[PDB]
Amino acid sequence: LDTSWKEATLPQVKAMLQKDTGKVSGDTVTYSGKTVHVVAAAVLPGFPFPSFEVHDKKNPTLDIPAGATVDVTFINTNKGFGHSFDITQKTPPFAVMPVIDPIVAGTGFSPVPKDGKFGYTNFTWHPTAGTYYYVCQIPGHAATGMFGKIVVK
């Protein structure tokens, strides 16, 4: 799993959030092109706890074109918790301690926000067609809704 983290101040976080290359429609974000950029964040201020936000939507379904290189940036903006962003083919409902192995691509637990900064990381993914789920591994978070669906077709 990806366990390399960097630190960003709030203006940087806001700059990164804007680089998500998807197009929104309802609660679905559709990507296109050879290399797509997904920028996900754990609980942006004002959004429900616990949840992921992508392109300013709460836990949206991501539609990725088969064959595309997926560059994912995950930022933890939630004070007090070190959420994770992990892709699995296991489906909901998720248990308190969810069984999601094998994890196809993902992040380890992120550092908690500190000293006016937020931890973030980048990882690459080359999916095969089919449906996946992005989830947080902190006990009880996926069970309470911190997960979204990904359709690679």
Ligand SMILES: [Cu+]
């Ligand atoms: Cu979480």
